């Protein structure tokens, strides 16, 4: 044999799967966090790619490492990885949306409270393991050589903003109605004497009830997360055509 | 005559370095972000959608709308170049042309006239104007177009807020802030009409 | 075909080369000590040939090792 | 552990801040109503009058509940620390 | 473009031929004293063409043999071996600079 | 005895090293950037146009308005230098002269007066002043000029903001925030007046 | 066995992989992440600085993993220096103490996920290969560090919510609560002796 | 058996490599930087004192407070080593002893107890712990001490911020930012109290 | 006695490495930098003058205000040195004296007193203190002096903000932010007073 | 003045480079009045000067970059 | 299996190698100075063998130090 | 005393360099009472001392740059 | 492993034996004329065993009354062979460190 074929193939058979894996990690909720150093994340991507190597099919040998076609392959591996990563960011920020709408309606940082708890939901439900299982499955059903995200995948991923508001409103509709009715009830009941008004007195009353309602929101938030994850996971499988 | 392999690699790496500029100055990224900036500003949420997801959705939206032009570049320029059918110099020109055509489809005649006189050059056809002058005219048209769409998106939310304020004042409670009451109504009406899907149709299809 | 087969094939290529270099180094060492102890069946020409090949073989081993480490050091200094 | 246990932790934390904010605010809310009703009885319409009285009791409440709120934050931190084994097991 | 063939040129095939020629020249020097052995020549142009995409030439003696039959002119073999080594060193420098320039462009260093 | 080729290259590589300083201090980049910054803050949008787009527009504008001086450098200092007609020392002076003249046309005599006294050099004519003195005087004049233009563009948006607040206060809805309702009108006025094309044309015409 | 010249080259090469071994095999990963999360918990951004954070982790990862280094020394280093064991056997004798430590500090679910992804049939958890155990170890340690770190975040988030609501109670909607909460965030950490409490639990967390 | 000259040169050339680690861990540089970092955040200015100036003053401060330990090292270890009175190991031990006395003087017992138990060694007196277990205990003690000092300095500026914010709410102008209207008073308090001298004096005083 | 040529180059090349440190610690760069930051904070724009421009003006001004010191360095130190009239020892000492004199003239006694007691040295007169005890004191006084000048400039913009805030509150609109309304007048006050010439002249004149 | 100092220093560099280049050309074209020692002393003389002006330029640019890359 | 125990053990391992290098250098220097001073019962082969050993031993000491210092710098300068 | 320690070390390096140059000048002038061994010994001592001076300076400057670039 | 004893092989001892052998041959040539001197031979395998002696050479021809058993024809040949083999041992042992240093430094 000529040693060029052996060495080049392994680099092509390792880095190209790694790029998709690494690109998903940098956009992922947990592995792409600001707390972890890039070096720890880099080693994690290297270790995952090495371990899941047997399940990854051999890349086509037609495309050369030093060629413009190989350059396009690197870019389209990232696009697949970022697609999975953005879905995870969409879910967590939707809960951040849920936290801030309650806080805004509470006459008021509350997004961080929901963001941290939703991160715990992601870790406790083994969401990170499922994403890693999804990306290795992507290697099977969406081969590296022939295959990339089409225009329909971009439009479906661009339509997730409506998914955010609809899901965030659905979670908070019961609480937001409660916030409005008590504030309207407080307004009408104290409207008899225009001397009292509310102003800052209304600020104190609104925030106490808003915090209390957030206590109710956290009581039944887990069920909403489970339904939300199913919607997000289905979108991810649609991207990888599984 | 054709550039050597070493020089072609240098040009390729250079365009990768300027890649963020090409997205935000030549593609549709500027219009989408500005319009989505208005939508976040129109509703009572200040930073609630957060900057990360807006850019990520904008990037995916651009790849959706730039797919025809990107595929046209792929077919006309990349395929002959990969098959070694054409030289690097003409392949670069064959890739530049679809970008120029797309920027012409999203610009205005008045904007081109201002910059072509500003550059102090001579031309008679808009089709062969230099890309250095087309870029400032393209984004200037994009900013004006985005403000038009954003203004139309801002009106229904202003409509809802004014109605709620009038209702509260008419009921006599001059003490309650309209923003807290109006926010769920703005969000509810944004969801039950599926507002984002409508915005996608009027934004992605606005280029054509 | 899977990616593990390519990795195993690359691993066997490196193992085969190391064994070949090690075989030459041990072969040169025996011929050196056979001629040095005073055995009359060993020719100085064969000894010099043996240690010439082992020296060249090991020098090739050093070059490959340095390139592997440099690539790894290049790899760890990347945005991620 | 399980996501439900995390929910219990976050509800417990939000419950504590509700106790913290209630102890501080309620003394100011009562004074706000007392002045507002007094103005209504006397037909006095100074909207900004009842700001310093709310501020005075709010500062007094912070001084009065200084020890209790400390003891409570520190013990909550110790409670979480002693609950770390739950995570490790 | 942007390929190793279009980048390295013929400096990768030339090196192999120059090493092949040195093996042929060294064989003639070693087999100089063997009677009946005929000196072996190598055509560089044909070998380079075969290497780029992919017979026995004998060297005519300048003087008759002294009876053994060996047509190896050791004066010429040393001269050709010296020339082959110089041109092989240039080819390594030519081929080595191809990789250095490629690495320089892909890294901007 | 012109500078040797090795020193000539060393000088040119140093000038490329200070290229951001030359653009941000010796050119029209600063005034355009500041005026765009004031206009962005004048409206309700905080950073909707984004910083990269603002600088991207300014870079093209500052290249177009300085094309005459750029050509004058080429026609008097570069082409004679390449054709082996002027000493490299002379060519450097021939390139610096149009740049100094342009900076003097956009500077204020008060700025020159204070910096000349600050440097403590006895110079009378306002044309043979050193670049060490001219550059701080020029950038100071550009900042003051940008503030004047920024105030000019700010006034119409202040008029809209006061009218909306006054109208809302007329109806007694003091709780309603004027900023949320004012913003669509600010976008409205700026787009039917063709603001983007207008401001960039005026900024281009300002440097004269 | 490999020649003397080659086995000197082997140890010299892997001598430069020592940082690699620390990050993804020993307790350096969990401590740094917990330290980083707690640093973000207080209002200070880089006051502890990266170098001090690393220096504490390096001392901690030596005290906590000290039993691992003891077994490697007496089972691999000592036999090799006495010529009682060969190069490959000594290297294998060092993997076993470290593979045992990594195996016990991971989550079953993560290992179950990774063996499925690696496509190897292993009947029992204690026989998994090190190629699949290393990614499983760091993935589980990341989850543990995030779960431990964010629980430390909660008391500092409690202070932020209390002070912000109090400021909003008086109508002072423009005063940023973060600058007001910063002095109290530092006080909570020093009153509970935080720098000793987290390290004591982190040291005792491993096995 | 004293080490060879080549090893001794190689041994103390390695100390220069670890010199930055000694400053940030075994010296007073850690506390001084932290206190001034919190002091900067206490005032309205975000990064006005700048990192380099903060480090510069800290380096001068840590040099002046560590002079007795540096003098003791020279007069106990460096001079006998240069005069061939003690060997290399004795000189190394003689240099370490004053350094250990400084760290143990400014540490906490509980911090020492925490680390001796984790390491797993017998301790009966404070002056028996190895430097490997004293370094992490010392920096932990310094961070707690630095936080306590920073808290004290923060309080007077917090009082001003609360006063000025409450006064504006007394007149009813809620939209006016307290931060802008409080920065001049925060700066002035730091002036007439002469903070830059007493705070540095306390930092020097706190170590002795 | 006199340092060898190789050692003289090594010392000179060493000082180039510390050139950035000497600019921000031993010159007028720091005070001018701080004042512009406070002046920028006083106005509504937080990043309009831009960091690069502010440092660029600070570098030009510190060249103008340190010219008497630099010329004295040239005359006293360099000219005898280049003419071989003084040794390398005398030239370095002769260069240090004018720089020390400049820092002594702008320092404060209490700051000198603070570090002298901290350094533990016996000093009879301020004009002979060591360099290591003067640099921390000089930068300390410059920071304090910078705050006093910044407070002077902050007041006029603060008064405008207070005036416009109270006028808006009088008319009953408690939801309109005074910062937006005040900004055009803050800019105008800096324009018709000719701020960019008045402020810089005072900063340059503050070292005389 | 300091400006004239900078100007003189550079004019010293090109004078050494100009003198070195002339001696190299005279020796190369076969002039019999030029010795190799004169060429080697001169060409090493300019090499040290040009290396010095490269290092000084590098240090000054690094100082400028450090000063301009600090938050104000 | 205590922190102090292992810390002493690796210190004992480290100080043993340093003493071994010191022994080779002192032995090399002792052989050189006896041959150089004129001692008759000292062969040049023993002098040359010893000083070659010391050079290799000291070269390993420097190279191992560089690996440790680089490894320390890699862990300290990482972007946490 | 630390100031004395630094100057004394520099004075030692400067003294060695002066001795090295002194012997080279005497030997090159043709002085009879100068041996090449002393000249080579003297200049080797100067080379080692100056190499130490450069490396120590580089270590201190590297230490300075690490501290100043630290984000506070 | 990885020790100088194994890295150098037996080439560290052969150089010494070739020096001792050269000394004995030099003694034999010098003492060729002195009567009563018996030629001394060195057994190579003995110093091999001493690494991991000083024998007598039996004459091939009778003496001539001197009793001296030194054959100068033999001594010159044995001195030539020892000197050639001594240089080879230096080459072998010298390259042991050259390879050893290249492994450590990697260059």
């Amino acid at each position: 044999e000529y040693p060029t074929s052996v060495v080049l193939d392994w680099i092509a058979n390792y880095f190209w799967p790694y790029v998709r894996i690494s690109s998903m990690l940098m956009v992922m909720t947990v592995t792409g966090a600001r707390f972890v150093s890039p070096r720890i994340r880099l080693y994690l991507g290297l270790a995952i790619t090495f371990a899941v190597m047997p399940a990854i099919p051999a890349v086509p040998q037609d495309i050369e490492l030093l060629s413009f076609r190989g350059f396009m392959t690197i870019a389209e591996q990232m696009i697949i990885g970022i697609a999975m990563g953005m879905v995870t960011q969409f879910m967590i920020q939707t809960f951040v949306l849920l936290g801030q709408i309650l806080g805004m309606q509470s006459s008021l940082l509350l997004g961080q409270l929901f963001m941290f708890l939703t991160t715990m939901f992601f870790l406790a439900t083994d969401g990170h393991l499922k994403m890693l299982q999804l990306v290795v499955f992507s290697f099977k059903t969406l081969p590296i050589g022939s295959g990339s995200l089409n225009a329909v995948d971009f439009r479906e991923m661009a339509g997730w903003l409506g998914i955010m508001f609809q899901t965030a409103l659905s979670m908070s509709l019961s609480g937001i109605i409660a916030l409005l009715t008590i504030n309207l009830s407080f307004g009408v009941m104290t409207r008899a004497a225009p001397q009292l008004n509310i102003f800052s007195l209304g600020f104190a009353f609104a925030l106490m009830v808003g915090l209390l309602l957030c206590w109710y929101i956290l009581a039944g938030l887990y069920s909403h997360y489970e339904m939300f994850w199913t919607v997000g996971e289905a979108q991810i499988c649609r991207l990888i055509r599984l | 005559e054709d550039y050597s392999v070493t020089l072609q690699i240098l040009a390729l790496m250079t365009m990768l370095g300027f890649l963020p500029a090409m997205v935000i100055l030549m593609t549709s990224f500027t219009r989408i972000v500005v319009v989505m900036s208005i939508l976040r500003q129109a509703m009572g949420l200040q930073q609630t959608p957060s900057n990360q997801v807006i850019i990520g959705i904008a990037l995916f939206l651009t790849f959706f709308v730039m797919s025809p032009v990107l595929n046209e570049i792929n077919d006309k320029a990349v395929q002959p170049y990969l098959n070694e059918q054409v030289t690097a110099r003409e392949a670069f020109d064959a890739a530049q042309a679809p970008m120029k055509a797309f920027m012409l489809k999203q610009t205005r005649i008045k904007d081109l006239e201002t910059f072509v006189t500003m550059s102090g050059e001579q031309v008679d056809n808009p089709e062969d104007v230099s890309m250095a002058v087309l870029i400032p005219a393209f984004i200037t048209s994009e900013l004006k177009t985005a403000f038009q769409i954003g203004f139309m998106l801002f009106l229904p939310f202003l409509i809802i807020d004014l109605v709620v304020a009038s209702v509260l004042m008419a009921m006599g409670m001059m003490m309650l802030s309209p923003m807290i009451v109006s926010l769920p109504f703005k969000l509810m009406l944004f969801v039950l009409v599926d507002g984002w899907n409508l915005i996608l149709s009027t934004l992605a299809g606005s280029f054509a | 075909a899977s990616g593990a087969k390519v990795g195993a094939d690359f691993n066997d290529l490196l193992t085969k080369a190391i064994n070949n270099v090690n075989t030459l180094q041990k072969a040169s060492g025996d011929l050196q000590t056979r001629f040095d102890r005073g055995d009359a069946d060993v020719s100085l020409s064969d000894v010099m040939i043996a240690r010439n090949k082992s020296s060249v073989a090991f020098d090739a081993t050093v070059q490959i090792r340095n390139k592997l480490v440099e690539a790894y050091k290049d790899l760890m200094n990347m945005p991620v | 552990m399980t996501p439900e246990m995390f929910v219990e932790l976050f509800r417990e934390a939000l419950w504590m801040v509700l106790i913290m904010v209630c102890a501080i605010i309620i003394p100011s809310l009562l004074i706000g109503l007392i002045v507002a009703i007094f103005q209504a009885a006397t037909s006095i319409n100074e909207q900004t009058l009842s700001f310093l009285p709310r501020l005075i009791v709010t500062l007094l409440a912070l001084m009065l509940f200084g020890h209790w709120m400390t003891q409570m934050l520190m013990e909550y931190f110790y409670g979480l620390i002693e609950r770390l084994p739950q995570v490790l097991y | 473009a942007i390929s190793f063939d279009n980048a390295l040129g013929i400096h990768q095939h030339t090196v192999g031929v120059r090493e092949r020629n040195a093996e042929v020249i060294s064989t003639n020097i070693a087999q100089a004293n063997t009677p009946g052995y005929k000196a072996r020549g190598l055509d560089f142009a044909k070998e380079l063409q075969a290497a780029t995409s992919g017979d026995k030439l004998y060297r005519l003696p300048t003087q008759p043999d002294t009876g053994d039959g060996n047509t190896v002119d050791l004066d010429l073999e040393r001269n050709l071996f010296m020339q082959n080594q110089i041109r092989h060193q240039a080819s390594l420098d030519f081929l080595g600079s191809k990789f250095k320039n490629l690495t320089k462009a892909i890294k901007g260093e």
Side-chain angles (χ1 to χ4, degrees), chain A, chain B, chain C, chain D, chain E:
Chain A
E1 87 287 63
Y2 60 102
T4 307
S5 181
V6 182
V7 189
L8 281 192
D9 287 0
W10 177 88
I11 302 179
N13 273 270
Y14 179 86
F15 205 75
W16 288 343
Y18 163 69
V19 167
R20 185 184 298 179
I21 294 179
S22 176
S23 304
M24 178 264 299
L25 295 178
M26 64 176 303
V27 200
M28 201 178 178
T29 292
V30 174
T31 60
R34 321 176 193 273
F35 315 97
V36 297
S37 65
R39 189 62 53 84
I40 296 179
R41 183 188 317 160
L42 163 66
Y43 280 149
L44 173 64
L46 261 20
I48 289 181
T49 309
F50 186 84
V52 310
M53 186 86 276
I56 302 176
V59 302
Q61 308 173 9
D62 194 4
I63 53 185
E64 191 184 9
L65 254 173
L66 186 68
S67 295
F68 195 87
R69 183 128 139 265
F71 303 158
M72 302 185 308
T73 304
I74 304 170
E76 60 189 355
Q77 292 305 100
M78 293 180 50
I79 303 180
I80 302 177
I82 302 174
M84 274 87 74
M86 290 302 301
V87 177
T88 51
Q89 295 279 176
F90 287 170
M91 309 184 195
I92 312 298
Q93 292 295 143
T94 304
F95 283 80
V96 181
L97 208 168
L98 178 61
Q100 278 155 317
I101 178 196
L102 295 169
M104 197 62 55
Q105 194 55 233
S106 306
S107 174
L108 194 150
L109 37 147
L110 275 185
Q112 288 183 304
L113 180 75
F114 279 54
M115 179 180 61
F116 298 150
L117 180 54
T118 313
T119 305
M120 312 320 255
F121 285 178
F122 188 79
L123 298 162
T125 60
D126 302 314
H128 45 275
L129 304 183
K130 296 181 177 59
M131 296 297 301
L132 299 181
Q133 284 185 158
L134 283 167
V135 69
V136 60
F137 292 164
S138 176
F139 294 135
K140 270 276 191 173
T141 174
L142 190 57
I144 292 181
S146 179
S148 181
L149 296 187
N150 199 22
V152 288
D153 288 327
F154 301 144
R155 204 268 180 174
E156 294 292 336
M157 290 291 299
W160 258 80
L161 187 58
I163 304 299
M164 290 185 174
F165 289 105
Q166 181 177 177
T167 311
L169 187 77
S170 302
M171 298 178 179
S172 61
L173 69 91
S174 61
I176 244 58
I177 290 300
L179 249 312
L180 294 185
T181 184
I182 63 100
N183 201 335
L184 291 182
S185 304
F186 190 56
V188 61
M189 188 172 301
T190 55
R191 232 284 141 272
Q195 315 293 146
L196 343 163
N197 303 125
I198 32 188
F199 42 92
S200 55
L201 179 144
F203 275 92
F205 178 82
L207 73 90
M208 295 184 310
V209 182
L211 296 176
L212 181 64
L213 261 300
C214 292
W215 190 67
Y216 296 159
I217 297 302
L218 299 182
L221 183 55
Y222 177 66
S223 296
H224 295 166
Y225 174 79
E226 289 296 329
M227 301 180 181
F228 198 13
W229 170 256
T230 305
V231 175
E233 177 197 350
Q235 168 60 241
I236 297 175
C237 300
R238 173 158 53 256
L239 292 172
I240 70 179
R241 318 181 198 276
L242 181 58
Chain B
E1 303 180 5
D2 183 56
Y3 301 115
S4 299
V5 179
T6 318
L7 206 61
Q8 299 179 28
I9 287 180
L10 193 72
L12 165 83
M13 299 296 184
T14 323
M15 295 183 295
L16 248 59
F18 289 95
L19 193 59
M22 309 174 65
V23 178
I24 65 189
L25 290 178
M26 305 178 59
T27 67
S28 70
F29 189 83
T30 306
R31 180 193 293 188
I32 299 176
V33 171
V34 172
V35 168
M36 294 182 71
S37 178
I38 307 300
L39 184 63
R40 171 161 58 102
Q41 187 74 10
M43 287 175 292
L45 308 174
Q46 290 79 356
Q47 321 275 358
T48 302
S50 73
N51 301 268
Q52 257 66 16
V53 318
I54 303 192
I55 299 167
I57 289 179
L59 286 179
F60 288 145
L61 226 182
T62 52
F63 297 149
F64 169 78
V65 299
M66 298 299 294
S67 183
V69 15
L70 285 180
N71 245 333
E72 187 177 6
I73 295 180
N74 178 29
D75 300 327
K76 214 172 305 304
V78 177
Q79 295 301 324
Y81 180 68
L82 278 179
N83 303 332
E84 210 162 349
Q85 175 68 20
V86 303
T87 70
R89 320 182 77 100
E90 52 200 353
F92 172 78
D93 301 354
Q96 177 183 0
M99 275 295 184
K100 174 168 298 185
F102 173 78
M103 293 186 302
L104 288 177
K105 262 62 179 180
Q106 313 300 143
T107 188
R108 294 174 174 86
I109 299 94
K110 182 180 182 61
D111 300 331
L112 250 68
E113 178 191 2
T114 293
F115 288 103
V116 69
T117 55
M118 183 179 176
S119 301
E121 56 181 357
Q122 297 284 357
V123 81
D124 49 351
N125 301 83
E127 296 178 344
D128 57 5
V129 67
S130 65
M131 192 161 55
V133 189
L134 224 173
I135 290 180
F138 170 78
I139 49 194
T140 301
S141 179
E142 287 281 50
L143 294 182
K144 180 181 179 300
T145 301
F147 280 177
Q148 288 176 323
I149 301 179
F151 168 73
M152 306 309 288
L153 303 190
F154 214 107
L155 286 178
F157 289 139
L158 178 55
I159 286 305
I160 301 165
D161 173 61
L162 291 180
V163 168
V164 176
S166 61
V167 166
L168 297 179
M169 296 304 107
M171 292 170 59
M173 42 206 311
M174 325 296 183
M175 33 186 270
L176 191 60
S177 60
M179 281 71 67
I180 48 183
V181 183
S182 60
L183 179 59
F185 298 146
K186 295 181 297 184
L187 289 178
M188 286 176 184
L189 293 178
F190 189 84
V191 170
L192 57 92
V193 199
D194 201 4
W196 179 239
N197 290 23
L198 274 68
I199 299 180
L200 280 173
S201 183
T202 191
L203 206 63
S206 59
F207 304 96
Chain C
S2 61
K5 305 172 184 177
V6 183
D9 196 1
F10 176 71
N11 187 85
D12 280 73
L13 180 65
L14 290 182
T15 298
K16 177 185 296 298
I18 293 181
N19 290 7
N20 295 331
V21 175
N22 166 257
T23 305
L24 295 180
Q25 292 195 4
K26 181 174 62 180
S28 170
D30 175 63
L31 277 178
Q32 286 184 188
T33 186
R34 281 228 314 272
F35 182 86
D36 190 61
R37 73 169 62 175
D39 289 0
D41 53 321
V42 193
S43 180
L44 222 178
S45 303
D46 292 72
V47 177
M48 287 299 178
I49 288 272
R51 54 192 291 265
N52 277 17
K53 296 182 298 182
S54 65
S55 300
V56 173
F58 174 67
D59 291 9
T61 302
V62 178
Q63 300 294 153
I64 303 175
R65 192 277 309 258
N66 290 124
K67 289 301 143 186
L68 294 182
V69 177
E70 288 180 21
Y72 173 77
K73 290 185 178 180
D74 179 26
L75 164 130
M76 50 94 81
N77 287 129
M78 79 194 318
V80 69
Chain D
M1 48 301 190
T2 58
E4 291 81 354
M5 294 182 181
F6 281 111
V7 140
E8 303 181 23
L9 213 176
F10 277 68
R11 294 173 88 263
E12 179 179 359
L14 227 179
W15 188 264
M16 179 174 298
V17 316
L18 196 149
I19 303 298
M20 300 278 97
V21 73
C22 167
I24 302 166
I25 284 191
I26 289 301
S28 66
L29 184 141
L30 297 178
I31 299 300
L33 287 182
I34 289 299
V35 179
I37 298 176
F38 153 79
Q39 292 177 345
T42 332
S43 67
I44 297 300
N45 200 13
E46 191 64 35
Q47 56 173 164
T48 182
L49 191 150
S50 183
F51 170 69
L52 178 63
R54 309 197 334 268
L55 178 55
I56 292 179
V57 293
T58 300
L59 296 177
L60 289 171
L62 290 169
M63 286 182 289
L64 186 128
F65 295 106
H67 288 269
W68 163 64
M69 295 185 180
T70 308
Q71 217 196 304
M72 196 166 184
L73 267 306
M74 291 179 58
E75 290 153 356
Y76 175 79
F77 202 101
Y78 294 155
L80 278 182
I81 285 299
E82 295 175 345
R83 271 181 283 178
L84 253 71
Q86 225 302 121
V87 165
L88 317 176
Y89 182 58
Chain E
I2 311 185
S3 302
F4 272 119
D5 305 7
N6 282 354
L8 271 19
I10 68 175
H11 305 291
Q12 48 174 341
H13 306 289
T14 307
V15 168
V17 179
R18 296 284 159 77
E19 288 187 350
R20 282 196 53 179
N21 192 27
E23 293 181 359
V24 175
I25 299 298
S26 67
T27 304
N28 298 336
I29 299 180
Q31 303 282 357
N33 293 263
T34 306
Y37 181 86
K38 301 305 177 182
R40 268 271 298 175
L42 197 73
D43 196 343
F44 177 81
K46 287 182 175 298
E47 282 293 336
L48 186 56
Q49 168 60 239
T52 315
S53 58
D55 190 6
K56 293 182 178 180
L57 292 183
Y58 295 91
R59 199 162 299 162
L60 296 178
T62 311
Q63 302 176 62
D65 45 293
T66 45
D68 50 72
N70 201 327
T71 59
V72 166
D73 185 10
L74 207 57
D75 313 334
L76 175 61
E77 305 292 340
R78 300 196 190 99
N79 187 265
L80 296 180
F81 196 92
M82 173 189 60
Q83 296 185 202
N84 179 84
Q85 187 173 354
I86 302 177
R87 309 185 81 94
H88 176 245
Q89 179 176 352
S91 299
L92 293 178
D93 206 334
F94 296 161
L95 182 59
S97 182
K98 293 298 181 180
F99 293 108
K100 292 192 298 181
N101 286 261
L102 258 60
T103 299
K104 180 177 186 63
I106 66 186
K107 307 183 68 174
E109 59 187 12

